[PDB]
Amino acid sequence: AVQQVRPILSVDREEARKRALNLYKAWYRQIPYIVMDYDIPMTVEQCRDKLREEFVKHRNVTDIRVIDMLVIKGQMELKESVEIWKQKGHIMRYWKESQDPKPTDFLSKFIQGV
């Protein structure tokens, strides 16, 4: 079920990690600047914590190509935060603080509607 297809950037899973971890470097190194530049509530530790979870967001990615794109997205978002194109609203977006975590257990769902 294999296909002999073009690459994008990374030719092997290890190069993929090499690229993926490079991004993790830029983001870790950037966090303090954004805490200063963007006047938002978030603090360095929380921003670091979210960065960890947000990589964990997709741990079981497998395809070399898919993981390459995820890194391509990150390098973009890095630059948009590195330079201050984004806005305090845009950067906080990662927390989703407007909506309360909706009910999850069956009764709370049942008693609160579909």
């Binding site: 530049d37 963007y38 006047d39 201050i84 806005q87 305090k88």
Partner: protein, 117 residues
């Protein structure tokens, strides 16, 4: 003079009183985190925004000072012209202006305002 001094003090006091008065006449509002940000066309201000001081504006103002002082030298010509000896007043003043022109025209051929940057 002090007639002038007192009038200026009176005006300044009346001026500050007016602005002091307007400061109470204008209604107050509860302060806001964002109402007191620098205006950058509605998109978040960047880092400190303190402009670079690598520029020429001091250079132009230095040209100002040179000509500003030179202006000082030539101010009194109006009054002394009736008293001073005419050769000395004539030649002395004429070479002032002549040197200024030559400095200017020599400096156009230099063209220092047309900087590369």
């Amino acid at each position: 003079m002090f007639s002038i001094i007192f009038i200026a003090l009176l005006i300044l006091l009346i001026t500050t009183i007016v602005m002091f008065l307007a400061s109470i006449l204008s209604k107050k509002a509860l302060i806001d985190r964002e109402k007191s940000s620098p205006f950058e066309c509605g998109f978040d201000p960047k880092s400190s925004s303190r402009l670079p001081f690598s520029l020429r504006f001091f250079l132009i103002t230095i040209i100002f000072l040179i000509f500003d002082v030179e202006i000082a030298l030539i101010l009194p010509m109006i009054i002394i012209m009736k008293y001073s000896n005419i050769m000395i007043w004539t030649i002395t003043s004429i070479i002032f202006i002549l040197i200024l022109l030559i400095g200017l025209y020599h400096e156009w051929n230099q063209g220092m305002l047309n900087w590369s940057n």
